[PDB]
Amino acid sequence: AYTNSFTRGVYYPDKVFRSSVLHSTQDLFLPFFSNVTWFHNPVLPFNDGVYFASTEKS
């Protein structure tokens, strides 16, 4: 299965404080509106980092 990663995958690239600032930084991010694999215990590659998400009720 596949799903749209609308605007998710943004993480604080460091431990630096900034207030009311537009900062440009290049690093490994999840591209917007890209494909994310959806599963309902397969082994997957770990090319350059993995964003993982889970919805839980139990």
Partner 1 sequence: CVNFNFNGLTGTGVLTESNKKFLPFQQFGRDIADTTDAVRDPQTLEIL
Ligand X SMILES: *[C@@H]1O[C@H](CO)[C@@H](O)[C@H](O)[C@H]1NC(C)=O
Residues that bind partner 1 (CB under 8 A): 12, 15-19, 21
Sorted by sequence, the CB contacts under 8 Å of residue 11 that are 6+ apart come out as 29
Write the interaction track for ligand X spanning residues 1-30; mark x where CB under 6 A is met and - where it is not: -x----------------------------
With CB under 6 A, what is the number of residues at the site for ligand X?
4
Upper half-sphere CA count for residue 26 (Cβ side, 13 Å): 0
Q: Choose which of 3, 29, 34, 53 interacts with ligand X (CB under 6 A).
A: 34
Sorted by sequence, the CB contacts under 8 Å of residue 58 that are 6+ apart come out as none
